[PDB]
Amino acid sequence: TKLKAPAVLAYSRKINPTNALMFAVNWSDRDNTTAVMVGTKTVAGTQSVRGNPNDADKGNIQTVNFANLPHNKNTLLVKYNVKFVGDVFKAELGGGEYSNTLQTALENTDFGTLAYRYVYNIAAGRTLWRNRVGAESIETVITVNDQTFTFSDLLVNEFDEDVDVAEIADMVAGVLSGEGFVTLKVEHYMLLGEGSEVFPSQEFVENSKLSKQLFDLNGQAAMHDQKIGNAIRTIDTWYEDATTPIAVEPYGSVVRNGVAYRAGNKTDLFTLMDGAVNGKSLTEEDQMFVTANLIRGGVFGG
Amino acid sequence: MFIRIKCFSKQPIAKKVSREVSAYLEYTGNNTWEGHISGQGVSNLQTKLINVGKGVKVVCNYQDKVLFAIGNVAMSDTGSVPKYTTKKVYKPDDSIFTLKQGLVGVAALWHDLGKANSYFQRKLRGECNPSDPVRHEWVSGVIVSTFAKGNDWLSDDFIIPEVKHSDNVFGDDQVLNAVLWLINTHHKKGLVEDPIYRATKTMFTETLQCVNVNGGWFNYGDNIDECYKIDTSFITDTYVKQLNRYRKKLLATKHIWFTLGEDQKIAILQECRVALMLGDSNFSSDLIGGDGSHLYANLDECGNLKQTLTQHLLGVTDCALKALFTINHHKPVKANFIPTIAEKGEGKFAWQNGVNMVDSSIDNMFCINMASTGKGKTLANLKLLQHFGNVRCSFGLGMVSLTKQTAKQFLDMGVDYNSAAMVTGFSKSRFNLGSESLDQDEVSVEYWGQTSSLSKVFPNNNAGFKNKKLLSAPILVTTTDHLVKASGVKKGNKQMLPYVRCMHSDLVLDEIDDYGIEDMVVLARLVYLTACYGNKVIISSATITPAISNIFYEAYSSGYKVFCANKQTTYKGVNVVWWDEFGIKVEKVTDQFSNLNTRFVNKRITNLLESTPKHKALVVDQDDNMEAVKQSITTLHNAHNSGGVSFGLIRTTTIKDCVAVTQELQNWETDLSIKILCYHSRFVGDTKAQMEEYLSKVLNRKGDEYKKFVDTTTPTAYIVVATPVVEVGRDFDFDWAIIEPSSERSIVQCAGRVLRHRSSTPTTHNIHILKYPFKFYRNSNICYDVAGYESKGYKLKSKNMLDIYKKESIVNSVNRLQGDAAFYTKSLTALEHKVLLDKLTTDIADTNVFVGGWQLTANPHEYCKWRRGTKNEDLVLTDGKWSGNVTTTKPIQSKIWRKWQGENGSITVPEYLLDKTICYNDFYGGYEN
Amino acid sequence: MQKQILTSQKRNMYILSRCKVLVKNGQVCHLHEDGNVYTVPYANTVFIGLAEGTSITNEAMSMLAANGVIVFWTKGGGYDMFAADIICHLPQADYRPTKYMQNWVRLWLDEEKKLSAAKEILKMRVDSLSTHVHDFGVDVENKRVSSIVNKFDKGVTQATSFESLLGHEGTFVKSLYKEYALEYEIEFKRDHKSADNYNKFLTLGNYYAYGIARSSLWALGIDNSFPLLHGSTRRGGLVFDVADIIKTSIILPLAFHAADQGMSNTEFKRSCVAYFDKNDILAYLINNIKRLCME
Amino acid sequence: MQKQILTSQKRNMYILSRCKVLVKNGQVCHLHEDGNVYTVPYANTVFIGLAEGTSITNEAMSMLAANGVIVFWTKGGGYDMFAADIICHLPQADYRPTKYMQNWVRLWLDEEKKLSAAKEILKMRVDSLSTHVHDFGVDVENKRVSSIVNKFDKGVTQATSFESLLGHEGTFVKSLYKEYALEYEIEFKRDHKSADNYNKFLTLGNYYAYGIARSSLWALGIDNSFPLLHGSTRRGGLVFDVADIIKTSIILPLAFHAADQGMSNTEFKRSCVAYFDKNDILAYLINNIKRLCME
Amino acid sequence: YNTISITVVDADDVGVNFVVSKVLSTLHNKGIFNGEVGVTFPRMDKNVGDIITLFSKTGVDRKVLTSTLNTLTDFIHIGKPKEADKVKTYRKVDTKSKGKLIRRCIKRKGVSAETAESLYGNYKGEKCKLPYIVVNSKSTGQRFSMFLEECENSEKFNSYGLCIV
DNA sequence: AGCAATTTAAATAGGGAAGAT
DNA sequence: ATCTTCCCTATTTAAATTGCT
Ligand SMILES: [Mn+2]
Ligand SMILES: [Mn+2]
């Protein structure tokens, strides 16, 4: 007993998405993909900072980025490849006095549901935060091992039953429970309207710097890989007072709301893995949450 | 349990208490109930009989003793239920009550004459500095002294004369000097910086003539001429007749004032000052509204002009007169007759039947309870208090947790919260986890109780929760600092609440040896003040030194002389009750206390010595104490272990010493399985509390429940390196201890932490005393001053413990009980006794215990500071993030057995160690790195 | 009500007769036709039985049930021969502790565990005899009582069914009834309908032990529909199974002494309060039924 | 006054208020407030209730219990009962627990029927939501509420353990709380300690739900110590489990309407008992417990 | 005047106010606010709130506006039409910053650029701290911030739900 | 000093009416 | 009906004073 957790214990990320490159298409002209360019407009304004009152007279020529659709294409296309990898129970930096006990404590994990919610967050449009808002038509095409799947009307908040997501979830759960990998090429086509302004992900700027950096690969608007990884693991409906699916965190913590849902109420990942290697009976939902964290990965040492 | 409740009440307060008392007992008719109920039923009946309102007139009888008496019902002195009680019972030569009335009335009509200067008027209106150059009490004293020098101050018309700046206002007339000291010290006492005056002044006026304006009143002094130009708008109808009637009252009674003794005058003027602040704060708290303008005294919360000075003086007078009347004519509310006390003690509590050798009708009692630990000392103290009748006492104890332990004993034996009041004035966040419903512990702060009649004379109806628990408690289980302020304070009215508390209640001070020397001086001052009003002092200390027991008896004897000559009764002596676990002895002692006390001490020593030796201590020869600790740990594990598992206590002196011993033992390569704990006091709220509860549940050896809190399967050395926080108030039982020597009472107390719960005698040696303290390598001139009575005035000639202690010795209380003044420079015990008789002496000095003449001054509260510590700033941990220069560090992780983490709380760092980083750590708290 | 006297620590018990029970000024009080209003300590009452000619309002039941007082009526099936339905209202507004129901029904459903529990409660009869001795009647240590207790234990040890149990009851009770009667020099036939004091005091003590047993049951949450003894003449449920632990130890010696020492109904009632609170019989039955369920 | 409550199929839970129940000319009657006597037919009633202002007498109690009319004492309204005895198979002929009670016990014991009955109690809670459609409340057929209903249905059907059912039950209950908060324009978070109108109105409505569920559990003889969802140490957990069926369907919309219009507590009590009388909510709970226990 | 509620729900992944602003934009672009439907917000303390409240005098039904906000249905909630005798009506307040009025001084007074800087150099630069929304304007191709504050009720409203004059 | 007569007054008990559930 | 609150209602206790022995 009293199997104390290793200080070096970490797990690798098992859902690896690429950067979500963003293109402009039409709804019936889906093959002509023109890359959405981040424009950048200059704004003239004096600097106002707390530490330098002497520098407020002149300076701060700032040039803020923006990204709209072109005025001939009404559909935004978002392309990214989500790579699910198996052996989520292998610790990369941990070892096997604790990670092997985790293997033999989370073998009864229903990966079917875990994978369903992953592919449902892929398909329903959780990966399209501010640009699925106000779109009159949502479409998702998933290409997986030469199989094409079409999704039109999936409400993203609840994980309802559709056999299309389920079909992919099968091979995704077979990867995640076993050994190997699977790759889902996900292209989202959302009809926002003619010249509607799109929403790339944001680089962190300083309190000063410029107003807003949109995410650029080679000049073209895109969204962060870790931001999509936040979308995919947004499956946590099993904490106490669970209203909406949150991103599976080791503490159940969302930064933008200023509260942590699983911290400080004995449902955090660390107490559940210590309970697993000390062998108390877990329910299915918290064990699924622990396996979702191990799929997410991260260093758990102290 | 069969009780009978009778009602004396008028009103429908004979009706709405009848619903509750008829909910729990059967009605026998004629407003009398009688029946069987449980003790918790008695508690529920008390709680819903007192809370129902004011005017409840309820007497309860369990068998034939009175259970409780709601209100000031006279009820039973001999028989119960009187007939009509009307008026005019005794009407004596009260004399000293008329003296206190005259002094308080004359001073209270003159206490705020000095607010009439123009500086106080613009201070209240707010166009100058709110701090006066000279305080208004001194200006009123200057007014009264100038009027006394000019006209005959006792029988004349008043008229305020032209006053100037006077450095001293105290003359020779003893009664005038009393009125002047009451006027000047109605806010704060004068403080005398003068060393020759502090050296020599003893008498009442002869010390009072040294109280000048420079002792706190003369703040800065640039607007003195405006501070002494005064208007005379007080000459009205009711003020002049009130002044005339009180002055003539004093005139008629001051003939008995010169027949008093010094001790009387000091205690009577202390009572007068307490009643004067009671009346002044009572009238300053409430808002009267009406005013006659042109002159003002106080300000409201909005800063508007209120309480004009004529009616302010009249209100302070009547409130102080009423304060005096209720504090001098109170039959105070006492506790319930606890039925789980009065039966026989069985087995190891069988000495508690010594109360059947004490007289139940003695007006005074000085108990010296020299019984050893584990015998139920506090239960015996409650038994001794209940032997004289119903209980009214203040259990003043050191530490919060010891008050919690005595409260839990009081709760589970027989005492509910209608009689008990646990007071810890810090609101600590140490909560009980695991199960709130299945706790059956964690004594809390509610006090259903009963509000006393003294709350109406305090400011703004006493206070909220805390002072209601203070004043109105029958039994007040409190930390001691809520009682030592009775002897007096620097600034404010914080003296009155413990003063009026200790006036009508007994005082029970347990383990007074753990206090400091100045702490024990002010505790014996409190004992003298408690004995000044006929209450009984129970001292409960096993390792008492004759010096301490003597000076506490002399304080009680001076107090009982005050009480005897105050009620015009001839002083027969003090009923001293020597008590231990082997017997009791009650003697009427007016003189020769020393031979009787030493004979009882020798009898207790002979009753301790034929018992088997439980603590055999060997002083090691190894000079270096680090490897002495190593070798002693190895030897006492190889000799004293319970099947391979042994518990050791490394008692060291200070915190960096503790972390040095810990960091050496963690890096110490040995075949022994050392598991190290740090147990000093510098720890965060959470971490510290966690250590406490764990240690209390693993070192409990009365049963084998600990086998499940530690790994006793594998042979392991469970070592706790601790500072003097382990030798005070800890119910710990170690297999053996290694002691760094600081004082001999530390040796006796850490012997009391070894085999505390077991009865098996050691074979070879269970204590290994280190050769030197660790301060020898840092300061060879003085090394025992930290947590010891060595000092700069009392230096040991040699620091070798072969020279100053026995090499093989059975450590018990005998060396502390005996008392030796000779050869104090080369033995630790005689060094201890020397200091104890040279600081707690039968003199008045200035920081002494018989203090007379200086009670009038602020000197015993400035130069004798209770809990005199270092500056002490508090670095606070807020959610894992430290406040000041802390820098969390990482411990050695070699042998730590248990380490609890902390996130909130605070650490107490001396200002000396604030310069550098205290470097807080999860394992050991504060150090120098 | 603060903590409220534990129901084992309530000492007052009443069976009111020919009165109107009501609430005056918040007082549970019974008023007779002579204009006399006697209060009841409702926060200390164990039970209030109601005899013939009695009546009680709603509010009196409301503040008796809030204070945990069991109220029964001595008529209906209260002729005590069939002992079918003594009308006994319990305070179930208070949500009782549950674990004694769980261990009780685990042993109830299991018939072998029910048989063993019945044997334990039958041994509680002789345990009660030994624990609660009386100094005005039969000595428990004489040869007849020791012989019949030994015969009862050796019969209940080798017992196989509840029909065999029903018979052992016949023996113990009937012969203890008789043994007292021969020592009290009275030809006695137990009859609930008989007029002699030896039977009216016995029926009054039957109602008193009914109230004690039902209060001990309800305290733990145990009902009455789960009895341990099943038989043709054992209609009445678990309250009589708990109550006949203390007939021959308490109720029967007090009733026989009362009749022989010419006590009145009121003083027999009081002698019953004195024995039920001096030896603390309610806490005895409550702790012993905790021993019965346990696991 | 005189109040009729249908409970199972044909027997009626009579509620009597401000009346004195006694025996006139050999049969049970009651004098009412208006000074007019009303008799009671023995054939059509089994449960008779005594609300506020009501007194019963001893021979009326005995004759009511001898006719199979088993009496209970309740707070005025008929759904806040504090005193009764336990239903048997017959009141006079024998003393056996009811078939419903025994069935419940057996179902609770074997782990599979306990899990199936926990799933079923939540199935009928979703049924209750649709069945009892309010006017002021949210639409049960609305897309968000139906999505919450189907989420709860999927979660209950796919669960194999009780703590999953507790998480799903809490999600459904507080999701309906969130939906009704979205209706009534407020930040509502369920806490018992808050003094706002919505939380304290929901609290006393929940206490009314506990009372009517306690009456429904008593009326089939179901004891208060066999909870389905809540733990074995929860005192009276079966009352909470049965009241859960109508807490989010009836108590929640009535309480949110009551806090929206802001009327006082007694008229919320009369609205709750009016909804209980009009749609036969107690009869719904009685049939619910029969279908649960019969299986 | 009878009124209807549009409460933004489940907008945590996207700010609540972005959904509020998109609700305003979709209510603008598909008609709704012809001249008589107005908006109000029950929870302006420092944020614009999460409830849009439409108090049209003729009466707004659920069906027309739920067909209008078919794009926001994933994270919207619509209450049934209730009544209110008094609604707390807001209006549009706009900000000017330097060059704005400079171009006005180009086109109204006809003065040169340097003297237009000269008359306005030490002036202007007001800073509105009122709660606001962020609006896509479609006729003028740039996105801006629109500030709302409490004013007396007006009979006529704009195409956005705010008071006129 | 106890008491008696005798006043004076504060309070206790009860009945009726009205308002709650 | 039951019970509570309050207003009469005067009936009912306790104190107060003071010659008288
Ligand atoms: Mn003053
Ligand atoms: Mn003053």
- Round to whole Å and give the CA distance between A76 and A138: 10
Please count the other Cβ atoms lying within 10 Å of the Cβ belonging to residue C177: 18
Residue A34's nearest CA partner among A224, A221, A225, A223 is A221
Neighbours of chain A (3+ CB pairs under 8 A): D, E
| First-to-last C-alpha distance (Å) of chain D | 38
Interatomic separation, CA of residue B3 and C1' of nucleotide G13, rounded (Å): 28
Q: Is the CB of C58 under 7 A from strand G?
A: yes
For chain D, counts of helices (H) and of strands (E): 10, 8
Residue C265's nearest CA partner among C254, C276, C275 is C254
3-state secondary structure of B924: coil
What was the structure determination method?
Answer: cryo-EM
Residue E71's nearest CA partner among E103, E119, E29 is E29
Sheet strands side by side (includes C12-16): C12-16, C45-50, C70-76, C86-91, D80-84, D70-75, D45-50, D12-16
Residue B834's nearest CA partner among B819, B855, B852, B849 is B819
Angle between helices D237-246 and D197-219 (to 10 degrees): 110
- Round to whole Å and give the CA distance between C190 and C203: 10
In this complex, do E26 and A134 lie within 8 Å of one another by their Cβ atoms? yes
In the complex, which nucleotide's C1' lies nearest to the CA atom of residue C58? G2
Question: What was the resolution (in A) of this experimentally determined structure?
Answer: 3.8
- Round to whole Å and give the CA distance between B235 and B163: 17
- Round to whole Å and give the CA distance between B617 and B615: 6
Task: Output the six-digit token pair for B314.
Answer: 């009249």
Residue D197's nearest CA partner among D270, D269, D260 is D260
Angle between helices C252-260 and C265-278 (to 10 degrees): 140
- B162, with CB counted inside 10 A (0-12, 13-18, 19+), is exposed
- Round to whole Å and give the CA distance between E51 and E49: 6
State the greatest distance between any 2 C-alpha atoms of chain E, in Å, as a whole number. Answer: 58
The answer to whether C125 and C171 have CB atoms below 8 angstroms apart is no
Length of chain A: 302
Tell me which chain A residues have a C-beta less than 8 angstroms from the C-beta of E50. Answer: none
B800-814: burial string, b at 16+ Cβ within 10 Å, e else: ebeebbbeebbbbbb
Residue A217's nearest CA partner among A78, A33, A38, A43 is A38
- CB of C266 less than 8 A from some CB of B: no
Q: How is residue B642 annotated by DSSP? A: B
CA E14 to chain centre: 19
Task: Look at the alpha carbons of C210, C213, C219, C220 in this order and tell me if their dihedral is positive or negative.
Answer: negative
- B307, with CB counted inside 10 A (0-12, 13-18, 19+), is buried
In this complex, do E77 and D182 lie within 8 Å of one another by their Cβ atoms? yes
Length of chain D: 295
The answer to whether C280 and C91 have CB atoms below 8 angstroms apart is no
The answer to whether B107 and B140 have CB atoms below 8 angstroms apart is no
DSSP output for D82-140: EEE---BS-SSS---B-HHHHHHHHHHHSHHHHHHHHHHHHHHHHHHHHHS--SSS--T
Please count the other Cβ atoms lying within 10 Å of the Cβ belonging to residue C100: 21
Task: Look at the alpha carbons of B343, B347, B350, B351 in this order and tell me if their dihedral is positive or negative.
Answer: negative
User: What is the torsion angle, in degrees rounded to the nearest 10, for the CA atoms of residue D207, residue D212, residue D218 and residue D224?
Assistant: -30
Residue B635's nearest CA partner among B806, B816, B811, B766 is B766
- Round to whole Å and give the CA distance between A237 and A244: 6
Sheet strands side by side (includes B420-423): B420-423, B475-479, B393-397, B506-510, B537-540, B366-369, B574-580, B583-589
For residue C114, give the amino acid letter. K
For residue B181, give the amino acid letter. W
Q: Is the CB of D52 under 7 A from strand G?
A: yes
Spell out which residues have Cβ within 5 A of ligand 2, the ion.
B 112, 280, 316
Choose the closest CB to D223 out of C65, C74, C101. C101
CB pairs under 8 A between B and C: 66
Residue with tokens 């659920």: E62
The answer to whether B159 and B232 have CB atoms below 8 angstroms apart is yes
Tell me which chain D residues have a C-beta less than 8 angstroms from the C-beta of A267. Answer: none
Please count the other Cβ atoms lying within 10 Å of the Cβ belonging to residue D36: 9
Tell me which chain D residues have a C-beta less than 8 angstroms from the C-beta of A237. Answer: 171
Show the beta-strand stretches assigned E in B63-196.
Answer: 65-70
The residues pairing with B645 across neighbouring beta strands, listed in sequence order, are B642
For residue E146, give the amino acid letter. M
Task: Output the six-digit token pair for B328.
Answer: 């001098």
DSSP output for E81-133: -EE-S----EEEE----THHHHHHHHHSS---HHHHHHHHSSS------S-EE
Question: CA of E13 to nearest chain A CA: how many angstroms apart?
Answer: 6
Task: Output the six-digit token pair for B313.
Answer: 């003086």
Task: Output the six-digit token pair for C30.
Answer: 């019974």
In the complex, which nucleotide's C1' lies nearest to the CA atom of residue D21? G1
- Round to whole Å and give the CA distance between B3 and B829: 54
Choose the closest CB to A197 out of E10, E26, E143. E143
- CB of A129 less than 8 A from some CB of E: yes
DSSP output for B33-56: EEEE--HHHHHHHHHHHHTT-S--
Protein-contacted positions of strand G (CB under 7 Å): 1-5, 14-16
- Round to whole Å and give the CA distance between B856 and B862: 13
Q: Is the CB of D76 under 7 A from strand F?
A: yes
Question: CA of A108 to nearest chain D CA: how many angstroms apart?
Answer: 13
In the complex, which nucleotide's C1' lies nearest to the CA atom of residue C59? G2
Angle between helices C111-131 and C281-293 (to 10 degrees): 150
Task: Count the alpha carbons within 13 Å of A69 in the hemisphere toward its beta carbon.
Answer: 24
In this complex, do C61 and D75 lie within 8 Å of one another by their Cβ atoms? no
Task: Output the six-digit token pair for E146.
Answer: 């629109």
- Round to whole Å and give the CA distance between A248 and A108: 19
Please count the other Cβ atoms lying within 10 Å of the Cβ belonging to residue B774: 20
Task: Count the alpha carbons within 13 Å of D68 in the hemisphere toward its beta carbon.
Answer: 12
- E112, with CB counted inside 10 A (0-12, 13-18, 19+), is exposed
DSSP output for B791-850: -SSS--S---HHHHS-SEEE-SSHHHHH---SSTTS-HHHHHHHHHHHHS-SS-TTTSSS
- Annotated binding-site residue? B112: yes
Q: Is the CB of D266 under 7 A from strand F?
A: yes
- Annotated binding-site residue? B312: yes
- CB of C233 less than 8 A from some CB of D: no
Are 3 or more Cβ–Cβ pairs between D and C shorter than 8 Å? yes
- Round to whole Å and give the CA distance between A236 and C191: 72
- B200, with CB counted inside 10 A (0-12, 13-18, 19+), is exposed
Task: Count the alpha carbons within 13 Å of B733 in the hemisphere toward its beta carbon.
Answer: 18
Task: Look at the alpha carbons of B1, B2, B7, B12 in this order and tell me if their dihedral is positive or negative.
Answer: positive
Q: Is the CB of B54 under 7 A from strand F?
A: no
Q: Mention every residue, 6+ apart, whose C-beta is less than 8 A from residue B865.
A: B518
Task: Output the six-digit token pair for A102.
Answer: 């985790």
3-state secondary structure of B663: helix
- Round to whole Å and give the CA distance between B494 and B486: 8
Residue C181 Ramachandran class (φ > 0 left, ψ -120 to 50 alpha, else beta): alpha
Q: Mention every residue, 6+ apart, whose C-beta is less than 8 A from residue B240.
A: B158
Least CA distance to C10: which residue of chain B? Answer: B37
SS3 string of B277-346? HHHHHHHHHCCCCCCCCCCCCEECCCCCEECCHHHHHHHHHHHHHHHHHHHHCCCCCCCCCCCCCCCCCC
The residues pairing with A187 across neighbouring beta strands, listed in sequence order, are A79, A141
- Annotated binding-site residue? B680: no
User: What is the torsion angle, in degrees rounded to the nearest 10, for the CA atoms of residue A238, residue A241, residue A242 and residue A243?
Assistant: 170
3-state helix, strand, coil in chain B (%, to 5): 35, 15, 50
Task: Output the six-digit token pair for B450.
Answer: 């009963």
- Round to whole Å and give the CA distance between B377 and B385: 12
Task: Output the six-digit token pair for E99.
Answer: 């060059």
User: What is the torsion angle, in degrees rounded to the nearest 10, for the CA atoms of residue D276, residue D280, residue D281 and residue D282?
Assistant: 100
- CB of D260 less than 8 A from some CB of E: no
Which of A159, A162, A283 best tests the D interface by mutation, with the highest count of D CBs <10 A? Answer: A283
B157 CA distance to ligand 1 middle (Å): 24
- Round to whole Å and give the CA distance between A283 and A280: 10
In this complex, do E72 and A136 lie within 8 Å of one another by their Cβ atoms? no
In this complex, do C25 and B19 lie within 8 Å of one another by their Cβ atoms? yes
Rg of the Cα atoms in chain D? 20
Residue A152's nearest CA partner among A130, A171, A128, A136 is A136
For residue B424, give the amino acid letter. T
The answer to whether B349 and B521 have CB atoms below 8 angstroms apart is no
- CB of D144 less than 8 A from some CB of A: no
Interatomic separation, CA of residue D205 and C1' of nucleotide F1, rounded (Å): 73
Helix (H) or strand (E) holding A13: none
- Round to whole Å and give the CA distance between B185 and A96: 77
Which runs of consecutive H residues, i.e. helices, occur in D132-264?
A: 143-158, 162-183, 197-219, 237-246, 252-261
Tell me which chain D residues have a C-beta less than 8 angstroms from the C-beta of A155. Answer: 147
Task: Output the six-digit token pair for D232.
Answer: 């074995």
The residues pairing with B479 across neighbouring beta strands, listed in sequence order, are B397
For residue A140, give the amino acid letter. T
User: What is the torsion angle, in degrees rounded to the nearest 10, for the CA atoms of residue B833, residue B835, residue B836 and residue B839?
Assistant: 160
Length of chain E: 165
The answer to whether B735 and B706 have CB atoms below 8 angstroms apart is no
Interatomic separation, CA of residue B79 and C1' of nucleotide G21, rounded (Å): 32
Q: Is the CB of C25 under 7 A from strand G?
A: yes
- Round to whole Å and give the CA distance between B856 and B210: 11
Length of chain C: 295
The answer to whether B356 and B376 have CB atoms below 8 angstroms apart is no
Phi, psi of A47 (to 5 degrees): -80, 140
- CB of D229 less than 8 A from some CB of A: no
3-state secondary structure of C217: helix
Residue C56 Ramachandran class (φ > 0 left, ψ -120 to 50 alpha, else beta): beta
- CB of A256 less than 8 A from some CB of E: yes
The answer to whether D249 and D125 have CB atoms below 8 angstroms apart is yes
Task: Count the alpha carbons within 13 Å of C133 in the hemisphere toward its beta carbon.
Answer: 8
- Round to whole Å and give the CA distance between A94 and A100: 10
- Annotated binding-site residue? B136: yes
The residues pairing with C12 across neighbouring beta strands, listed in sequence order, are C45
Helix (H) or strand (E) holding B154: none
B115 CA distance to ligand 2 middle (Å): 9
- Annotated binding-site residue? B915: no
Interatomic separation, CA of residue B84 and C1' of nucleotide G14, rounded (Å): 9
3-state helix, strand, coil in chain C (%, to 5): 50, 15, 35
Residue A181's nearest CA partner among A102, A298, A87, A117 is A87
User: What is the torsion angle, in degrees rounded to the nearest 10, for the CA atoms of residue B368, residue B369, residue B371 and residue B372?
Assistant: -90
- Round to whole Å and give the CA distance between B899 and C77: 68
CA angle D54–D55–D58, rounded 5-degree value: 150
Q: Mention every residue, 6+ apart, whose C-beta is less than 8 A from residue E155.
A: none
Q: Mention every residue, 6+ apart, whose C-beta is less than 8 A from residue C171.
A: C148, C151, C152, C155
The answer to whether A168 and A184 have CB atoms below 8 angstroms apart is yes
Task: Look at the alpha carbons of B107, B108, B113, B119 in this order and tell me if their dihedral is positive or negative.
Answer: positive
Interatomic separation, CA of residue C72 and C1' of nucleotide F9, rounded (Å): 50
Task: Output the six-digit token pair for B93.
Answer: 């030569």
- Round to whole Å and give the CA distance between C116 and C107: 9
The answer to whether D68 and D88 have CB atoms below 8 angstroms apart is no
B193 CA distance to ligand 2 middle (Å): 27
- Round to whole Å and give the CA distance between C158 and C146: 19
- Regarding beta strands A137-143 and A181-191, do their DSSP bridges make them parallel or antiparallel, or are they unpaired? antiparallel
Phi, psi of B579 (to 5 degrees): -145, 135
Please count the other Cβ atoms lying within 10 Å of the Cβ belonging to residue A28: 6
